[PDB]
Amino acid sequence: ALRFEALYPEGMCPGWSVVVKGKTSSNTSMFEINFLSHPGDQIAFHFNPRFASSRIVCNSFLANHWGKEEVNKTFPFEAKEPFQVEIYSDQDYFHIFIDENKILQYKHRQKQLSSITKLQILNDIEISSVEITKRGL
């Protein structure tokens, strides 16, 4: 289920931050934050905290396939507890921060950064805030 979507047709990458605040309803499910590229609504970056297994899975869905999963070692979320996730893009990576700690970097696979125009947030997250802000390099 779609919880939030945003569209910025001029392109929200690189040099933008997305800050999502909220909490899960359960410890048995998952949510995702996806950055989509146009045309095709391909998934440039999929950030998928899975609470049942306590793993963050990151990947891309390009040319109709999921690529190699990048799975984080730590799981710095607690179910039903408020969190802040920030995703900041530079020319080389998405940088992920949770509760103001840097957690992981994900190297761009979709190199056409300016075609990333859409953000989708799905599944088990009760959102309290979404901020989309142009930062600079």
Ligand X SMILES: OC[C@H]1O[C@@H](O[C@H]2[C@H](O)[C@@H](O)[C@@H](O)O[C@@H]2CO)[C@H](O)[C@@H](O)[C@H]1O
Choose the one of ligand X, a copy of itself, none that binds residue 2, judging by a C-beta under 5 to 8 angstroms depending on kind: a copy of itself
Specify the DSSP element, H or E, that contains 10: none
Position 41 contacts a copy of itself (CB under 8 A): no
> Quick check: 67 and 113 in contact, CB under 8 A?
no
Interface residue with ligand X among 66, 76, 114, 126 (CB under 6 A) is 66
Q: Are 5 and 119 in contact (CB under 8 A)?
A: yes
Neighbours of 23 (CB within 10 A): 16
Stated length of the chain: 137
Out of 41, 69, 92, 131, the only residue in the binding site for a copy of itself (CB under 8 A) is 131
Q: How far is the CB of 134 from ligand X (least distance, A)?
A: 27
Q: Tokens 């020319």, residue?
A: 91
Q: How far apart are CA 54 and CA 60, in angstroms?
A: 20
Tell me if 120 contacts ligand X by CB under 6 A: no
Contact partner, 69, from ligand X, a copy of itself, none, Cβ < 5-8 Å per class = ligand X
| Contacts with ligand X, residue ranges (CB under 6 A) | 46, 48, 57, 59, 66, 69
